[PDB]
Design a protein around this ligand. Structure first.
Ligand SMILES: OC[C@H]1O[C@@H](O[C@H]2[C@H](O)[C@@H](O)[C@H](O[C@H]3[C@H](O)[C@@H](O)[C@H](O[C@H]4[C@H](O)[C@@H](O)[C@H](O[C@H]5[C@H](O)[C@@H](O)[C@H](O)O[C@@H]5CO)O[C@@H]4CO)O[C@@H]3CO)O[C@@H]2CO)[C@H](O)[C@@H](O)[C@@H]1O
Ligand SMILES: [Ca+2]
Length: 147
């Protein structure tokens, strides 16, 4: 109203891996992983792996983080979607806003948070598949919207 601002670049992986860092060389944008559109992100099983992007959030602002994910077989651990940054306080507090997934059917989760007055480091959006079973992880439509 009149627009909703989304802060995630290439949120649906429709531009492949554009804008996303592939930390463990274990990511591909493939039709297999799509929940919407032509592509989704597949993070390959067998080792902990993930990727992410840096996001310039505004201070004192309400954001909604949301994502769709599923594992293609039962995981031991989880796949986590995280917004993280440091505060500029005495303890340099590291803040993490976390969605945890372990489902084998496509599942949507979301959370709301409000950013501080000042950031101690540039916010990062992390897609972290910490599970080490053979399960592949699909994730799609990762949104971070200002309201
Ligand atoms: O690989 C080369 C590449 O590395 C980049 O650095 C990456 C690195 O590769 C990743 O391994 C690393 O992954 C970390 C995630 O970013 C971060 O979100 C995650 O944080 C954990 C946290 O440690 C943990 O305490 C927390 O537990 C919560 C549970 O999830 C909840 O269920 C429960 O209720 O509460 C607890 C406590 O809050 O979970 C979160 C989410 O999993 O830790 C990951 C590592 O274990 O990210 C690095 C980037 O930040 C590097 O930048 C590149 O330059 C390089 O090329
Ligand atoms: Ca998609």
């Amino acid at each position: 109203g009149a627009h909703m601002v989304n802060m995630v670049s290439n949120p649906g992986f429709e531009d492949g891996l554009d804008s996303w860092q592939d930390w463990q060389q274990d990511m591909s944008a493939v039709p297999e992983a799509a929940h919407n559109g032509a592509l989704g992100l597949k993070i390959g099983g067998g080792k902990a792996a993930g990727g992410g992007q840096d996001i310039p959030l505004k201070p004192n602002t309400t954001y909604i983080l949301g994502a769709w994910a599923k594992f293609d077989s039962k995981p031991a651990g989880t796949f986590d979607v995280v917004v993280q940054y440091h505060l500029k306080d005495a303890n340099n507090t590291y803040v993490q806003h976390i969605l945890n997934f372990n489902e084998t059917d496509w599942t949507y989760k979301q959370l709301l948070f409000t950013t501080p007055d000042v950031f101690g480091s540039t916010p990062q959006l992390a897609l972290w598949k910490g599970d080490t079973s053979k399960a592949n992880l699909y994730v799609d439509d990762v949104y971070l919207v200002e309201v």
